[PDB]
Amino acid sequence: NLYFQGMTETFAFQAEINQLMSLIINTFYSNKEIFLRELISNASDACDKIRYQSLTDPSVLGESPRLCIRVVPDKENKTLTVEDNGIGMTKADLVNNLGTIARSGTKAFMEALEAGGDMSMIGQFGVGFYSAYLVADRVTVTSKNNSDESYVWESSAGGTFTITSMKRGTRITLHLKEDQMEYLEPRRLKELIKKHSEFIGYDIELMVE
Amino acid sequence: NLYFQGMTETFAFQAEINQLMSLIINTFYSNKEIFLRELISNASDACDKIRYQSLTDPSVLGESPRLCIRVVPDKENKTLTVEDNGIGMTKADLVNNLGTIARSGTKAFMEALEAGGDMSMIGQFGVGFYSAYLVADRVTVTSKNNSDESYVWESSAGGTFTITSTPESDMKRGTRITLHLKEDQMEYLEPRRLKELIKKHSEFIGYDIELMVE
Ligand SMILES: CO[C@H]1/C=C\C=C(/C)C(=O)NC2=CC(=O)C(NCCN3CCCC3)=C(C[C@@H](C)C[C@H](OC)[C@H](O)[C@@H](C)/C=C(\C)[C@@H]1OC(N)=O)C2=O
Ligand SMILES: CO[C@H]1/C=C\C=C(/C)C(=O)NC2=CC(=O)C(NCCN3CCCC3)=C(C[C@@H](C)C[C@H](OC)[C@H](O)[C@@H](C)/C=C(\C)[C@@H]1OC(N)=O)C2=O
C-alpha cells in the first residue's frame, strides 16, 4: 500500500556465532582497544574490493572515487563510528555473513582461545568484527552495495539481530559500554589509530565534534 | 531461514482514521467508560459470525466449541484486555479494516460530532473500536482467523500502526484487545468498577462475559 513506511526482521544467530558473541561481550580480556584496528582493517578490505572492481569497470565508483576511512566519536550519543565508502553489503551479505551462516573461523577461534591463544588474533579467523562487543553493548551496521538498497543491521548480543529497510559504503556504530567512554576522547583515538594503521593504504580521518 | 524469529511492518493510517484517532485520544468527553461496552459488542459480533459459519460447516469451531468473551485486568502491566474466541481477523482484515481503508462511518462519525452528536453514538458508525483511546495511550490487537496465521496489530495514535508476525503458534482461533491505560484512567483495572460496568450494558449481549480475577 501507499501507506507502508518500513519493515524490520529479527533473526537468531547461528549457534557458534552466538557463542562467540557471548564470549566476547563477557570476556575479562584486558586489551580491549584492539577492536578499532579490526574495524579499520575491515574498511580497508571493503575499499580494496571496490577498487579491484573499478579496474575493469570504472563506473562502480559512482561520483565517489576517493576511497577513505573515517572515525566519528559522538560524546552526546555515547557512540563511536567507523565508516567507509568501500563496496558495502547487500541484505544477503548482512543476513548470511553477519549472522546466520558461520565460516570456519568462528569455531576455530574459539578452539584457539580454549588452547591459550590470544584474543588479538581474532582477525585471522575472519570474525574480528565481533570484537566490537569488547567495548560495546550494541552495534549498528548501515551499508549500501551498488546492487541493493541500503540496510541497517543491529544487535545487542542478545541472541538475535534485526534487519531494517545513503551513499555506497558502510558505517559501524558502537554504543559504548558504561566503563569504555575513553574511546570518545580524541587524544586516545589519535594515538590508537596511529599505533596500528602504518600499513593501511587508505587515509584515516578522525572527525572532530 | 531456520533462524527467522519475527517480522514487523509499520504502516501509516489513512488520513481520516488518523483524524478520528487524534480526536478520540484528545477529546474532553466525560463519560469515558463507554469503551468497554463497545469492545464487548465487537467480541459479540466476532462470535456471531463464526457461530453462523458453524451451522453449515461445524468443523470451523476446532477444539473450542464454547463461544464466550473474557475481560482481563492486569494491575502490574497497567493494562486491560477483552478477549474472544470468535471468527478472528486475517492480516488483510487488520491492515485494511483496522488502519488503511476507511469505511463511510469514519468521516460520518466525525461530521456527526461536529454537528453536536454524542461520543456514545460511535458504535452506529462502525468505529467504536477506536473508543479504546478514550482510556488508552496504546492498544494492541492479537488475532487468529482460521485462514491465516496470528498477527499483532499495535498503535499509539502517532499516525502509524505496526503488524507483527511470529512463527510461534501460541494463539488459537479468536482475538485479544489490550489497552495500555492512561495514567488518570487506572479506575478501569479495579474489579468493583468492571463488575458494575459490565452489568450496566450486557443484558442484550447473547454470549457469556467472564471477568477474570488475577
Ligand atoms: C562489517 O565488517 C565486514 C563484514 C563482516 C566481517 C566479518 C564477519 C569479520 O568479522 N571479518 C571478516 C573480515 C574481512 O575482511 C572479510 N573479507 C576479507 C577477509 N580476507 C580475505 C583473505 C584474507 C582476509 C570477511 C569475509 C566476508 C565477510 C567479506 C564480506 O562479505 C562477503 C565483504 O566482501 C566485505 C567487503 C565486507 C566487510 C569487510 C565488512 O566491513 C565493511 N566495513 O564493509 C570477514 O568475515
Ligand atoms: C476490535 O476489533 C474489531 C475490528 C474492527 C472494529 C471496528 C472497525 C469498529 O470500530 N467497529 C466495527 C464493529 C463491528 O462490529 C463490525 N462489523 C460488524 C457489523 N455489525 C454490528 C452488529 C452486526 C453486524 C465492523 C465492520 C468490520 C470491521 C468487521 C470485521 O471485518 C474484518 C470483522 O468481520 C469483525 C468480526 C471483527 C471485529 C468486530 C473486531 O472485533 C473482534 N473482537 O474481533 C466495524 O468496523
XYZ file of C-alpha atoms and ligand atoms in Angstrom:
515
model
C 0.000 0.000 0.000
C 0.865 3.708 -0.316
C 0.814 3.934 3.485
C 3.682 1.451 4.080
C 6.683 3.031 5.883
C 9.132 0.310 6.988
C 9.937 -3.300 7.872
C 12.261 -4.904 10.411
C 13.120 -8.613 10.587
C 14.566 -10.308 13.681
C 16.806 -13.391 13.229
C 18.556 -15.695 15.715
C 22.305 -16.104 15.279
C 23.809 -19.353 14.097
C 24.823 -21.181 17.297
C 28.613 -20.820 17.054
C 28.365 -17.104 16.243
C 26.032 -16.717 19.257
C 28.611 -18.438 21.395
C 31.337 -16.132 20.091
C 29.242 -13.050 20.821
C 28.611 -14.177 24.424
C 32.262 -14.955 24.977
C 33.498 -11.649 23.589
C 30.866 -9.474 25.313
C 31.663 -11.137 28.685
C 35.405 -11.638 28.460
C 37.814 -10.229 31.049
C 40.371 -9.680 28.255
C 42.412 -6.647 29.310
C 43.390 -5.212 25.916
C 40.000 -4.100 24.619
C 41.389 -1.332 22.384
C 42.097 -3.940 19.617
C 38.518 -3.516 18.316
C 39.402 -0.381 16.371
C 42.209 -1.988 14.370
C 39.781 -4.702 13.352
C 37.055 -2.285 12.282
C 39.608 -0.280 10.290
C 41.097 -3.424 8.762
C 37.599 -4.403 7.593
C 37.083 -0.980 5.989
C 40.353 -1.327 4.150
C 39.204 -4.680 2.740
C 35.880 -3.152 1.671
C 37.769 -0.364 -0.050
C 40.172 -2.836 -1.700
C 37.305 -4.836 -3.208
C 35.572 -1.879 -4.901
C 39.000 -0.728 -6.060
C 39.548 -4.034 -7.908
C 36.071 -3.818 -9.454
C 36.972 -0.367 -10.760
C 39.963 -1.649 -12.768
C 37.675 -3.361 -15.293
C 34.611 -1.170 -14.653
C 35.307 2.481 -13.503
C 31.560 3.258 -13.236
C 31.302 1.257 -9.966
C 32.966 4.200 -8.137
C 29.890 6.373 -8.958
C 30.531 10.025 -8.025
C 32.698 8.928 -5.029
C 36.146 7.672 -6.300
C 38.303 8.987 -3.406
C 38.306 5.925 -1.133
C 38.938 6.559 2.579
C 38.047 5.629 6.139
C 36.600 7.997 8.790
C 36.355 7.642 12.630
C 33.494 9.521 14.288
C 33.227 9.934 18.072
C 29.915 11.234 19.434
C 30.061 12.267 23.109
C 26.303 13.033 23.207
C 25.017 9.675 21.911
C 27.918 7.783 23.561
C 28.846 6.145 20.251
C 31.942 5.612 18.149
C 31.591 5.021 14.411
C 33.895 3.695 11.704
C 32.715 4.449 8.182
C 33.965 3.740 4.666
C 32.961 4.231 1.025
C 34.015 0.671 0.152
C 31.988 -1.945 -1.715
C 29.422 -2.220 1.084
C 26.972 -5.051 1.684
C 23.662 -6.374 0.335
C 20.867 -7.744 2.518
C 22.036 -11.305 1.789
C 25.587 -10.321 2.695
C 24.343 -8.980 6.029
C 21.961 -11.814 6.816
C 24.377 -14.576 5.708
C 27.845 -13.260 6.657
C 26.872 -11.192 9.651
C 24.697 -13.736 11.430
C 23.142 -16.918 10.018
C 25.913 -18.770 8.194
C 29.219 -19.164 10.081
C 32.561 -19.659 8.354
C 35.269 -21.970 9.701
C 36.815 -19.262 11.805
C 34.111 -18.958 14.444
C 34.713 -22.403 15.846
C 38.451 -22.376 15.196
C 38.918 -19.071 17.003
C 37.013 -20.364 19.991
C 39.132 -23.521 19.899
C 42.320 -21.401 19.684
C 41.206 -19.371 22.730
C 40.453 -22.590 24.624
C 44.045 -23.754 23.911
C 45.504 -20.484 25.298
C 45.584 -18.375 22.141
C 45.133 -14.636 22.299
C 42.070 -12.560 21.545
C 44.225 -10.242 19.388
C 44.475 -12.944 16.684
C 40.718 -12.648 16.067
C 41.116 -11.050 12.571
C 42.997 -14.038 11.291
C 39.823 -16.121 11.826
C 37.506 -13.780 9.876
C 35.397 -12.833 12.922
C 37.127 -9.633 14.164
C 34.050 -7.525 13.531
C 32.649 -9.162 16.659
C 35.479 -7.667 18.745
C 33.271 -4.531 18.782
C 31.464 -6.153 21.741
C 34.577 -5.933 23.889
C 33.676 -2.220 24.254
C 30.069 -2.145 23.051
C 26.691 -3.484 24.266
C 25.023 -2.778 20.908
C 26.341 -2.435 17.383
C 24.565 -0.905 14.392
C 25.812 -1.526 10.841
C 24.359 0.529 7.998
C 25.538 -0.438 4.478
C 24.794 0.037 0.790
C 26.151 -2.053 -2.077
C 25.664 -0.794 -5.672
C 23.364 -3.764 -6.386
C 20.913 -3.372 -3.471
C 19.113 -0.812 -1.355
C 20.625 0.299 1.951
C 20.020 -1.778 5.117
C 20.535 -1.488 8.862
C 21.796 -4.472 10.804
C 21.663 -4.168 14.579
C 22.423 -6.481 17.512
C 22.900 -6.298 21.297
C 24.428 -9.789 21.521
C 21.114 -10.965 22.992
C 20.969 -13.985 20.694
C 19.363 -12.087 17.800
C 19.757 -9.266 15.288
C 17.417 -7.071 13.284
C 17.438 -6.116 9.597
C 15.638 -2.876 8.757
C 14.916 -1.178 5.408
C 22.759 6.815 1.878
C 25.826 6.598 -0.406
C 27.828 3.443 -1.203
C 29.800 2.172 1.807
C 29.401 1.060 5.419
C 29.020 2.692 8.887
C 29.738 0.659 12.029
C 28.297 2.484 15.048
C 29.181 1.150 18.512
C 27.111 2.030 21.543
C 29.950 2.112 24.127
C 29.649 0.334 27.470
C 29.478 2.343 30.739
C 33.199 1.759 31.503
C 34.536 2.246 27.917
C 33.959 6.007 27.485
C 37.697 6.563 26.880
C 37.130 5.662 23.147
C 35.304 9.001 22.644
C 38.280 11.178 23.720
C 40.181 12.413 20.592
C 43.722 12.144 22.047
C 43.052 8.449 22.793
C 41.684 7.827 19.280
C 44.564 9.643 17.550
C 47.215 7.590 19.354
C 45.272 4.362 18.821
C 44.753 4.940 15.063
C 48.437 5.823 14.563
C 49.535 2.748 16.555
C 48.130 0.135 14.079
C 47.474 1.913 10.711
C 51.045 2.294 9.435
C 50.312 -0.139 6.579
C 46.701 0.756 5.782
C 46.831 2.305 2.329
C 43.732 4.444 2.749
C 43.595 7.760 4.565
C 42.034 7.501 8.016
C 40.176 10.692 9.023
C 39.475 11.359 12.719
C 36.421 13.640 12.694
C 36.287 16.268 15.464
C 32.987 17.316 17.085
C 15.939 -19.203 7.100
C 15.839 -21.637 10.032
C 16.847 -18.682 12.208
C 13.977 -16.268 11.353
C 12.048 -15.265 14.512
C 9.640 -12.456 13.517
C 8.736 -9.508 11.275
C 7.105 -6.131 11.942
C 5.763 -3.791 9.246
C 4.934 -0.136 10.056
C 2.036 1.473 8.124
C 0.640 4.976 8.221
C -3.078 5.308 8.926
C -5.307 6.565 6.164
C -5.912 10.298 6.730
C -9.454 10.098 8.096
C -8.699 7.286 10.560
C -5.754 9.328 11.789
C -8.078 12.256 12.350
C -10.518 10.076 14.324
C -7.694 8.730 16.445
C -6.315 12.225 17.261
C -9.785 13.432 18.181
C -10.615 10.488 20.478
C -7.197 10.366 22.216
C -7.558 14.147 22.921
C -11.291 14.762 23.461
C -12.578 16.110 26.772
C -15.569 13.695 26.703
C -16.682 12.975 30.283
C -18.256 9.505 30.151
C -15.091 7.633 29.121
C -16.442 4.234 30.339
C -18.382 3.591 27.099
C -15.330 1.885 25.534
C -15.958 -1.308 27.450
C -19.477 -1.741 26.036
C -18.030 -1.130 22.562
C -15.169 -3.646 22.719
C -17.574 -6.204 24.150
C -20.099 -5.579 21.368
C -17.290 -6.233 18.898
C -16.422 -9.526 20.604
C -20.110 -10.479 20.394
C -20.055 -9.763 16.638
C -16.995 -11.932 16.080
C -18.697 -14.784 17.974
C -21.876 -14.450 15.860
C -20.022 -14.632 12.524
C -18.290 -17.937 13.412
C -21.369 -19.390 15.169
C -23.222 -18.848 11.914
C -20.466 -20.413 9.790
C -20.677 -23.448 12.135
C -24.325 -24.145 11.139
C -23.181 -25.340 7.669
C -19.553 -26.270 8.468
C -19.263 -27.347 12.160
C -15.508 -28.122 11.784
C -14.803 -24.348 11.999
C -15.009 -24.461 15.828
C -11.835 -26.606 16.018
C -11.405 -27.644 19.671
C -13.106 -24.509 21.115
C -16.891 -25.014 20.693
C -17.941 -22.825 23.677
C -18.061 -19.194 22.462
C -17.513 -16.507 25.137
C -15.857 -13.161 25.990
C -13.394 -12.640 28.872
C -12.199 -9.390 30.484
C -8.674 -9.429 31.933
C -7.348 -6.564 34.101
C -3.595 -6.539 34.841
C -2.506 -4.282 37.743
C 1.240 -4.850 37.045
C 1.486 -4.147 33.251
C -1.160 -1.433 33.742
C -3.399 -2.973 31.028
C -6.991 -4.133 30.434
C -7.870 -6.862 27.910
C -11.020 -8.024 26.111
C -10.630 -11.487 24.563
C -12.930 -13.574 22.374
C -12.762 -16.947 20.615
C -14.731 -15.575 17.651
C -14.094 -15.788 13.906
C -10.922 -13.691 14.196
C -9.189 -11.473 11.635
C -6.665 -12.147 8.863
C -3.671 -9.928 8.102
C -5.671 -8.194 5.352
C -8.565 -7.716 7.778
C -6.302 -5.965 10.294
C -4.393 -3.863 7.775
C -7.483 -2.835 5.727
C -10.272 -2.543 8.283
C -8.066 -1.509 11.225
C -5.793 1.020 9.527
C -5.686 1.798 5.798
C -9.145 1.534 4.198
C -11.644 3.821 5.952
C -15.292 2.878 5.863
C -18.041 5.507 5.411
C -18.634 5.813 9.172
C -15.269 7.353 9.923
C -15.887 10.628 8.150
C -19.567 10.418 9.048
C -18.987 9.997 12.826
C -16.674 12.981 12.832
C -19.203 15.057 10.907
C -21.886 13.938 13.391
C -19.777 15.033 16.394
C -19.061 18.296 14.634
C -22.887 18.825 14.497
C -23.444 18.133 18.201
C -23.759 14.354 18.183
C -22.510 12.486 21.226
C -19.485 10.193 21.558
C -21.748 7.391 22.855
C -23.266 7.040 19.356
C -19.854 5.945 17.953
C -20.998 2.307 17.641
C -23.593 3.156 14.946
C -20.822 4.346 12.659
C -18.777 1.146 12.867
C -15.816 2.841 14.546
C -16.410 2.011 18.231
C -13.089 0.184 18.497
C -11.217 3.457 18.433
C -13.048 4.459 21.635
C -10.359 2.420 23.383
C -8.214 5.579 23.095
C -10.538 7.449 25.475
C -8.749 5.470 28.197
C -5.590 4.155 26.491
C -2.391 5.657 25.036
C -1.620 2.323 23.314
C -3.739 -0.572 22.027
C -2.553 -3.998 20.905
C -4.792 -6.375 18.950
C -3.832 -10.034 18.657
C -5.949 -12.089 16.261
C -6.130 -15.510 14.627
C -8.564 -16.384 11.813
C -8.774 -19.968 10.533
C -7.491 -18.848 7.084
C -4.254 -17.161 8.257
C -1.510 -17.116 10.900
C -1.702 -14.991 14.069
C -0.879 -11.281 13.738
C -0.282 -8.451 16.179
C -1.611 -5.012 15.385
C -0.428 -2.121 17.544
C -0.723 1.666 17.600
C -0.231 4.626 19.946
C -2.195 7.113 17.797
C 1.068 8.541 16.403
C -0.116 8.432 12.792
C 1.109 4.836 12.318
C 0.466 1.217 13.306
C 2.524 -1.988 13.242
C 1.734 -5.540 12.038
C 3.943 -8.188 13.654
C 4.057 -11.908 12.826
C 5.899 -14.656 14.777
C 6.190 -18.361 13.706
C 5.322 -19.395 17.338
C 1.685 -20.611 17.231
C 0.693 -19.626 20.785
C -2.695 -18.301 19.632
C -5.871 -20.329 18.977
C -8.853 -19.044 16.962
C -10.001 -15.644 18.326
C -8.913 -12.086 19.165
C -7.456 -10.181 22.161
C -7.641 -6.388 22.526
C -5.138 -4.998 25.050
C -5.339 -1.385 26.214
C -2.363 0.240 27.922
C -4.337 2.618 30.160
C -3.564 6.332 30.517
C -2.269 7.388 33.951
C -5.528 9.060 35.038
C -7.636 6.063 33.874
C -6.465 3.384 36.347
C -10.013 3.010 37.735
C -10.780 0.506 34.895
C -8.494 -2.139 36.452
C -10.330 -2.345 39.827
C -12.766 -5.315 39.928
C -15.655 -3.394 41.588
C -15.571 -0.822 38.738
C -15.579 -3.506 35.998
C -18.337 -5.583 37.654
C -20.746 -2.609 37.656
C -19.780 -1.500 34.113
C -20.282 -4.957 32.517
C -23.701 -5.433 34.151
C -24.693 -1.877 33.115
C -24.608 -2.821 29.379
C -24.716 -6.625 28.879
C -28.426 -7.589 29.076
C -28.749 -7.929 25.290
C -25.260 -9.461 24.781
C -26.056 -13.007 23.578
C -22.872 -14.586 24.972
C -21.291 -15.084 28.381
C -18.947 -12.394 29.741
C -16.360 -13.664 32.273
C -14.489 -11.124 34.443
C -11.173 -12.752 35.426
C -9.515 -12.472 38.849
C -5.698 -12.218 38.528
C 31.243 -5.132 8.763
O 32.536 -5.751 8.567
C 32.692 -6.574 7.388
C 31.629 -7.634 7.394
C 31.805 -8.797 8.043
C 33.031 -9.105 8.774
C 33.235 -10.260 9.449
C 32.224 -11.354 9.550
C 34.503 -10.406 10.143
O 34.466 -10.394 11.350
N 35.654 -10.487 9.462
C 35.849 -10.501 8.066
C 36.750 -9.587 7.555
C 37.060 -9.486 6.200
O 37.892 -8.619 5.830
C 36.413 -10.363 5.200
N 36.822 -10.388 3.924
C 38.257 -10.294 3.660
C 38.989 -11.329 4.512
N 40.244 -11.783 3.928
C 40.336 -12.341 2.580
C 41.606 -13.187 2.682
C 42.326 -12.809 3.976
C 41.478 -11.782 4.725
C 35.461 -11.402 5.676
C 34.769 -12.335 4.687
C 33.423 -11.736 4.205
C 32.525 -11.434 5.397
C 33.601 -10.495 3.299
C 32.379 -9.588 3.143
O 31.202 -10.265 2.699
C 31.451 -11.117 1.572
C 32.621 -8.459 2.135
O 33.295 -8.931 0.973
C 33.404 -7.269 2.703
C 33.516 -6.216 1.610
C 32.698 -6.676 3.907
C 33.359 -6.279 5.008
C 34.853 -6.370 5.129
C 32.620 -5.690 6.168
O 33.296 -4.499 6.544
C 32.846 -3.319 5.874
N 33.005 -2.171 6.515
O 32.344 -3.410 4.763
C 35.173 -11.462 7.141
O 34.357 -12.299 7.574
C -11.991 -4.934 17.872
O -11.683 -5.416 16.554
C -12.841 -5.482 15.687
C -12.396 -4.888 14.369
C -12.793 -3.708 13.881
C -13.749 -2.850 14.548
C -14.089 -1.660 14.041
C -13.519 -1.136 12.759
C -15.057 -0.866 14.774
O -14.675 0.050 15.472
N -16.352 -1.177 14.663
C -16.897 -2.234 13.913
C -17.680 -3.135 14.616
C -18.284 -4.234 14.011
O -18.974 -4.988 14.736
C -18.101 -4.509 12.556
N -18.734 -5.483 11.891
C -19.994 -5.990 12.351
C -21.097 -5.003 11.999
N -22.243 -5.469 12.754
C -22.593 -4.868 14.035
C -23.605 -5.858 14.594
C -23.953 -6.844 13.481
C -23.073 -6.556 12.269
C -17.304 -3.576 11.753
C -17.094 -3.832 10.269
C -15.885 -4.770 10.024
C -14.618 -4.082 10.500
C -15.980 -6.165 10.664
C -14.682 -7.003 10.614
O -14.230 -7.149 9.264
C -12.872 -7.586 9.169
C -14.856 -8.406 11.197
O -15.778 -9.128 10.363
C -15.317 -8.424 12.657
C -15.768 -9.809 13.079
C -14.194 -8.048 13.599
C -14.395 -7.257 14.680
C -15.754 -6.707 15.012
C -13.259 -6.943 15.605
O -13.728 -7.287 16.905
C -13.252 -8.555 17.411
N -13.225 -8.726 18.732
O -12.903 -9.413 16.615
C -16.690 -2.417 12.446
O -15.999 -1.621 11.789
